[model samples]
Target chain A: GLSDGEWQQVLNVWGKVEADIAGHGQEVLIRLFTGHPETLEKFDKFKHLKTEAEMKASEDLKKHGTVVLTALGGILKKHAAHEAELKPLAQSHATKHKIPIKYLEFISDAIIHVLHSKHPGDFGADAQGAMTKALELFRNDIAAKYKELGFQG
Target chain B: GLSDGEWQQVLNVWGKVEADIAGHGQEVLIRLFTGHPETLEKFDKFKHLKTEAEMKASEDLKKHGTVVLTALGGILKKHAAHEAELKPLAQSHATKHKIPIKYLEFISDAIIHVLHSKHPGDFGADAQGAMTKALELFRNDIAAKYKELGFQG
Candidate 1:
């Protein structure tokens, strides 16, 4: 569980990203794919694309990328209100988009990268701590859901 | 993510069924189609199966059982990867055959009943629970895919 102060810090940083979640979200996926080339094999839409330029340019990638932060935005909002709303989608995504949990952990890494690099002023030390903790909690929650659902992804 | 207790119980019950995974898998399918006769109409080879006894003896049924159980065996063989194979299997099934998710859910019921009937001692309540939950977990994953593919069932 996250502390009150931590949640606020996370929200503060999220506010910055929320302004351009789609663009920032795409960057997160790009950063993730760049670091772990193998992870690219997981996505049907973008898997065939060889170059960074190709991946960055894909409409499919944009759609999926947009879904990422938008979902996170909703989850974060729900989390702040002591709700578990986004919990349901994991079971649904378990069906077709069975991407592994490790990639998700890496996506967290990419998220932090985007926040740190793109909005340096907003994502300061306290926000960094909050983001890290919140994402760990996020990862733990998601990994548990995937595992409980019997998805390797 | 299943603890040692359930895994042991599952494998223990599986051992009895594993003696003839193909045959047992076939029996499971027969039981499934018996309950939902319309399912027989889904698979071309199985569509002709009108009676339970004949279905039990059908070579086509046995081969399908072998395919399903052998793949399940692989899911068990891996430490923590399931949907990588099962979801993709669902996609192929959905795309090629258009079999609905209910049929997948039905197979799970057949599995549980089959285990309990053949070896009541090994397939105790705990075993029953684990297998049931496991089947549902697999079920939802497959069902989610069907929903994604726009299949009504």
Candidate 2:
């Protein structure tokens, strides 16, 4: 859990980008799918869609992208309290969706890149570290659930 | 299109449920599917699941329900700003997925019921009125896009 000051810092940074949160969210997905094209196979909505351009133009992509941003925002707003909330989600994704653990772990770097690119100097090393750690904390929570459900790797 | 005060009321009320937002989100979906079983035909994942208990226990249901809640929270957070964001979604659901506008509209009431049930005394008439109006505003936005895509309902 972030210290109160760190949480405050995150809220401050998020406040600046809140208006464009959905756009940032979409960018993260675009980067993920573009950079790791194989990950698209996990989604029936996106699997048949080829090309970054085609995927970007997809309604399914946008909707799911919106969901990603919204879920991230929900988690970030009060990270500690929501761990239990994310538990079943992590288990379900691993157990039911069969999304590879590595792919699930890969999205944080893409998100961090967008935060830095979008904010530039405003998002300093401290903010970057905080964001990175925060995302990793979430990834760990998801991973832990998978482990509990007897999933490895 | 909520007044700043109305939006504040919403945020405050949502804050109470944010910890269990995904749970609340799933409840809304379960209530919707249970109350209107025909709506299950909309999704391949949910169509074969017969009972509410089964749907409630479904991993796919939880994932999609989480998506549903996340998307709604996104819209609620910045209601006016996301209309443009949601337009394409509406068009896609109607045109690509063939989701009937009526079923799309039906979930709002279910959500309202959940909010009321979950937070008995807190979500008063003012909150209820504001939420109802706000959900309707979103419904209209989605429906308008459907109309643009050549659907009357």
Candidate maximizing lDDT:
1
> Which candidate wins on DockQ?
2
Chain A of candidate 1 compared with the true chain A, TM-score: 0.51
lDDT of 2 at A25: 48
Q: How accurate locally is residue A75 in candidate 2, as Cα lDDT from 0 to 100?
A: 38
Question: Model 1 clash pairs?
Answer: A100-A153
Model 2 regions lying over 4 Å from their true place:
A1-153, B80-153
A1-153: candidate 2 lDDT, tens digit per residue: 233444444444445435665555455566666655655655677888778788768877877766755643443454423432565566566776665556534444544454465455545675566555545545666676677777776
Clashing pairs in 2: none
lDDT of 1 by residue, B101-131 (tens): 6554544454345445544765666556654
Q: What is the lDDT of candidate 2?
A: 0.56
What C-alpha lDDT, on a 0 to 100 scale, does residue A83 get in candidate 2?
33
Per-residue lDDT, model 2, residue A146, is 77
Best by TM-score: 1
Candidate 2, B9-64: lDDT as tens digits: 44444454466655655665666566555555556678888887887888877777
